[PDB]
Amino acid sequence: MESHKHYTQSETEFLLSCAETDENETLDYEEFVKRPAKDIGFNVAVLLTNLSEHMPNDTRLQTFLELAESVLNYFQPFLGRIEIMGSAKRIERVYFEISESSRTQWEKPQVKESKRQFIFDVVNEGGEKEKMELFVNFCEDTIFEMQLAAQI
Amino acid sequence: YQQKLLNYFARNFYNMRMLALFVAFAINFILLFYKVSVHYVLEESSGYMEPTLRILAILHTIISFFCIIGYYCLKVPLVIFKREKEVARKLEFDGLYITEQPSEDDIKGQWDRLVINTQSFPNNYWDKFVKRKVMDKYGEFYGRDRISELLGSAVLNSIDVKYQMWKLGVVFTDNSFLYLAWYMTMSVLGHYNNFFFAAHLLDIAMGFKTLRTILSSVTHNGKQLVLTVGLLAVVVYLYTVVAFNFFRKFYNKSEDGDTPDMKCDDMLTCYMFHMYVGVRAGGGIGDEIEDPAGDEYEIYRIIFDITFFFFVIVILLAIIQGLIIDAFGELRDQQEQVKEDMETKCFICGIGNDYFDTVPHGFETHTLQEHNLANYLFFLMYLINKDETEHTGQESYVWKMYQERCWEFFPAGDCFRKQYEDQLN
Amino acid sequence: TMSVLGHYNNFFFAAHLLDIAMGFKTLRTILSSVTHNGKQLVLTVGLLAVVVYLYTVVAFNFFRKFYNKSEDGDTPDMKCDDMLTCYMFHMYVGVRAGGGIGDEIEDPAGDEYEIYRIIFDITFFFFVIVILLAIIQGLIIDAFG
Amino acid sequence: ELRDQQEQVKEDMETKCFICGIGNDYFDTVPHGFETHTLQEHNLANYL
Ligand SMILES: [Zn+2]
Numbered sequence: 064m065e066s067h068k069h070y071t072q073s074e075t076e077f078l079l080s081c082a083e084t085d086e087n088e089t090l091d092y093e094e095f096v097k098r099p100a101k102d103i104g105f106n107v108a109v110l111l112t113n114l115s116e117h118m119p120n121d122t123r124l125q126t127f128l129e130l131a132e133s134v135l136n137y138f139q140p141f142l143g144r145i146e147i148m149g150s151a152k153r154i155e156r157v158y159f160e161i162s163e164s165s166r167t168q169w170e171k172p173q174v175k176e177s178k179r180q181f182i183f184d185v186v187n188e189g190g191e192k193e194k195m196e197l198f199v200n201f202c203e204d205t206i207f208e209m210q211l212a213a214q215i
Numbered sequence: 216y217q218q219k220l221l222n223y224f225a226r227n228f229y230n231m232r233m234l235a236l237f238v239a240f241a242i243n244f245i246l247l248f249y250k251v252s253v254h255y256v257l258e259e260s261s262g263y264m265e266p267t268l269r270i271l272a273i274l275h276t277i278i279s280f281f282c283i284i285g286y287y288c289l290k291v292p293l294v295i296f297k298r299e300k301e302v303a304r305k306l307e308f309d310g311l312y313i314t315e316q317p318s319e320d321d322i323k324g325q326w327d328r329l330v331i332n333t334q335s336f337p338n339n340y341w342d343k344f345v346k347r348k349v350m351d352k353y354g355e356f357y358g359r360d361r362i363s364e365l366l367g368s369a370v371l372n373s374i375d376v377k378y379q380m381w382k383l384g385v386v387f388t389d390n391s392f393l394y395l396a397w398y399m400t401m402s403v404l405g406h407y408n409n410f411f412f413a414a415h416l417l418d419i420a421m422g423f424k425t426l427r428t429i430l431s432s433v434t435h436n437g438k439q440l441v442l443t444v445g446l447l448a449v450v451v452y453l454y455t456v457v458a459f460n461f462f463r464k465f466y467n468k469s470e471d472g473d474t475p476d477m478k479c480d481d482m483l484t485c486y487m488f489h490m491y492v493g494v495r496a497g498g499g500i501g502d503e504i505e506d507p508a509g510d511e512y513e514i515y516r517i518i519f520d521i522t523f524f525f526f527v528i529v530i531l532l533a534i535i536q537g538l539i540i541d542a543f544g545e546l547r548d549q550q551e552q553v554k555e556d557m558e559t560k561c562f563i564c565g566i567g568n569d570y571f572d573t574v575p576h577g578f579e580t581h582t583l584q585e586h587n588l589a590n591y592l593f594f595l596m597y598l599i600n601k602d603e604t605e606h607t608g609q610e611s612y613v614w615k616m617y618q619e620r621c622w623e624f625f626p627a628g629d630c631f632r633k634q635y636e637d638q639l640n
Numbered sequence: 641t642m643s644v645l646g647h648y649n650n651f652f653f654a655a656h657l658l659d660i661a662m663g664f665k666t667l668r669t670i671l672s673s674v675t676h677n678g679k680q681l682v683l684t685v686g687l688l689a690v691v692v693y694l695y696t697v698v699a700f701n702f703f704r705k706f707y708n709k710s711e712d713g714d715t716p717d718m719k720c721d722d723m724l725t726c727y728m729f730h731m732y733v734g735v736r737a738g739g740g741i742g743d744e745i746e747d748p749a750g751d752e753y754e755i756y757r758i759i760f761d762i763t764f765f766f767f768v769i770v771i772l773l774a775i776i777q778g779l780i781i782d783a784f785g
Numbered sequence: 786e787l788r789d790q791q792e793q794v795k796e797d798m799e800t801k802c803f804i805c806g807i808g809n810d811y812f813d814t815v816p817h818g819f820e821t822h823t824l825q826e827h828n829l830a831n832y833l
């Protein structure tokens with residue numbers, strides 16, 4: 064723990080003081096499942112994301128986004144956002160987590176050919192309200208597919 | 216260990232599938248060095264080919280078995296997901312077996328009755344409150360107990376049969392499983408005669424993608440092609456009618472003169488003659504017929520010959536060629552159009568790439584951050600993965616709309632920026 | 641190297657006439673059409689080879705007796721009874737005949753395989769002689785368009 | 786050319802009102818509005 068972060072009382076030696084578990088002159092790997100912490104980080108990342116996206120144009124908060132950039136880089140792949148028509152008759156964001164299993168299962172395997180065939184058949188045949196339920200059926204069958212492919 | 220082996224064949228379905236193709240190639244390559252005196256084998260001074268054939272046939276049958284098991288493990292759950300999902304949606308939002316009771320046609324629906332009475336209907340659709348919701352929806356208008364009676368190393372000692380009869384009736388109707396069973400039957404009957412292994416080389420059309428696109432052109436207009444051949448048959452029937460009425464004496468396919476006659480004087484034989492050498496001659500029927508040098512039917516036989524040529528040999532061939540090339544061009548138009556429509560417009564909204572590109576790159580921001588196919592599906596999968604109590608007002612509203620199937624939450628003709636233009640809003 | 645080996649044999653200078661494709665612009669555009677879909681063209685020829693392999697399989701199993709390319713009767717036989725020789729025969733005069741394989745084979749006048757040999761002949765014609773040629777032509781014209 | 790003909794008639798019917806010739810641009814500001822125009826108000830059927 065020298066290259067990954069710098070070395071202070073409060074960066075590296077802080078961890079080595081947290082890592083005062085064993086008397087065998089060693090350290091087990093339970094300090095990492097102890098430290099857990101990133102579940103707070105996702106919600107605070109989403110907090111700052113909603114604060115920035117809904118309320119931009121504030122230098123005072125931009126200062127804090129500079130502080131939280133290192134965490135936002137961590138939570139960017141898992142932090143999804145989408146926009147939907149709301150109960151108050153307005154579009155607004157829905158910030159929400161993304162898993163890695165669904166990501167890796169959605170990206171690499173044969174399901175991309177399924178998405179290509181889906182988009183092709185949709186935009187060729189077309190439909191008025193025969194588009195979004197087709198998308199949701201594709202999504203549900205694909206969710207089942209990614210679940211089944213995770214199961215091996 | 217059984218479960219690990221089954222997951223192996225499921226996961227390794229494509230690899231074993233690709234492997235059986237090349238075993239078929241190796242079999243059919245060794246098939247080239249056959250002879251007769253009975254269909255023996257004579258190699259180029261190498262007696263190793265027969266044991267390779269003997270073991271490779273066994274490998275072919277074995278790997279066909281493993282591919283079939285991989286298909287049964289992997290792709291069958293998906294189609295059953297679709298089926299039970301369809302059945303649940305029909306029970307909920309249409310009340311099929313309550314109100315409709317479909318006809319003798321729709322044999323799927325007539326077959327999908329014994330599944331209704333089972334416990335394990337919602338086995339894979341991950342929606343188990345189906346019977347309860349249908350009881351809520353038709354508990355008094357039609358009946359309450361009517362609905363309920365309508366609806367409801369120690370592994371190999373107890374299992375359902377009511378659901379499983381329906382399931383096996385499903386899987387015996389699926390096409391790819393039927394193909395793999397045909398593949399297995401040809402690999403088994405390869406033992407009875409090794410020439411049967413040549414049937415497995417036709418799996419290249421399923422295997423290769425580009426070959427499937429090569430085949431799509433002739434597949435695209437097979438019906439009109441078969442109509443062209445039927446019209447060809449009708450035209451040759453009219454031509455041999457005109458021949459049998461008039462032109463029989465010229466139909467002498469005997470040897471040189473003063474010979475027994477080998478003639479076409481009937482109608483069926485003349486029709487077979489016209490279909491067999493009228494069209495398969497490259498020049499028409501007049502080539503394989505005694506030339507009309509100074510006859511009263513000289514001009515009429517000449518008219519017969521040239522009209523047969525310029526219609527049968529020319530027009531129907533050109534129509535077949537136009538059909539295949541029109542399939543090529545039309546599939547090109549299809550892919551051009553899908554690229555056009557995806558580039559121009561949002562898949563979700565249909566704004567067009569005109570409102571956003573005022574800002575740099577904005578259409579791509581719209582498609583890649585906000586209104587994503589991916590992020591939307593991940594929110595779907597999230598709420599399927601989430602619990603209804605933990606939902607926000609947003610997620611509860613949306614999950615309500617999901618399981619009652621509204622799709623109004625989806626943006627259409629609008630967006631976050633269109634709503635919230637930067638104008639103190 | 642071709643100009644040097646032209647000293648060894650002056651016929652080697654004919655290789656240098658193929659530089660017209662590099663030289664002329666319009667000839668490069670003439671050549672681009674067939675170059676544009678060379679892969680699918682080669683796949684068409686491979687499919688042709690596979691189809692002729694199936695056809696000569698059906699022949700070697702059944703139709704060997706008609707494969708008599710000898711002189712008039714009472715002659716030594718010059719026949720195709722093997723599988724490799726029959727495959728070469730189909731690829732050499734089945735497709736290079738303008739009419740199919742039935743032209744270069746004894747006619748089936750009154751045989752038990754008369755209708756089956758007729759089916760063999762017309763299917764060989766209407767598939768091998770027609771469809772793959774039309775696909776090659778469609779490929780080059782689609783490259784043009 | 787016959788393919789071009791049928792492509793063009795589908796194009797022109799989808800784009801535009803048979804009656805008015807507005808185009809499918811003024812109405813789709815509202816959801817589904819072009820189809821309201823063709824199926825409720827300015828109908829071939831209701832006019833006949
Ligand atoms: Zn959009």
Ligand SMILES: [Zn+2]
Binds near residue numbers: 806807
């Ligand atoms: Zn109008």
